[PDB]
Amino acid sequence: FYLQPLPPTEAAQRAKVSASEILNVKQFIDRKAWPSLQNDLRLRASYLRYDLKTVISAKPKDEKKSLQELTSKLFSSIDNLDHAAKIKSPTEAEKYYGQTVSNINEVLAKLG
Ligand SMILES: [Zn+2]
């Protein structure tokens, strides 16, 4: 993946879109198409990572830390879902997909 950066909340709009596309990998979990789930998750993850850092930098310092922490949890669960796909476990994939959805809602709530 190659990315072309964007400014404050042009990037939050794109982050919200990558976040939604991430919700969409459940179908890959259901068909158990692990490599597809991983490639899609990876791309979305790369966009999301870049745009959240951007949205964070242009955030009043009083709320940078808070978003940064929700952002950090999100990428931990995203990684964990990539790991679950890597080891081909419907169990773990389902668990981390769950945690990922909850972490996305948290970041979305702080967005908009
Ligand atoms: Zn910090």
CA of 26 to the centre of ligand 1 (A): 31
Q: How was this structure determined?
A: X-ray
**CB of 59 closer than 8 Å to CB of 96:** no
CA of 65 to the centre of ligand 1 (A): 5
Domains annotated for the chain, with CATH where assigned, are 1-112 (1.20.120.290)
* Dist. CA 27–CA 17, nearest whole Å: 17
Return the structure tokens found at 77: 């669960």
Q: How many alpha carbons fall within 13 Å on the CB side of residue 58?
A: 12
CA of 96 to the centre of ligand 1 (A): 24
Q: How many alpha carbons fall within 13 Å on the CB side of residue 50?
A: 17
Task: List CB contacts of 12: < 8 A, sequence separation 6 or more.
Answer: 51, 55, 111, 112
User: Which of 83, 75, 24 is closest to 51 using CA atoms?
Assistant: 75
* Dist. CA 79–CA 96, nearest whole Å: 9
CA of 2 to the centre of ligand 1 (A): 26
CA distances from 35 to 85, 88, 91 (A): 7, 9, 16
CA of 12 to the centre of ligand 1 (A): 19
Residue type, 33: A
CA of 80 to the centre of ligand 1 (A): 22
Measured CA angle at 27 (ends 13, 6), to 5 deg: 20
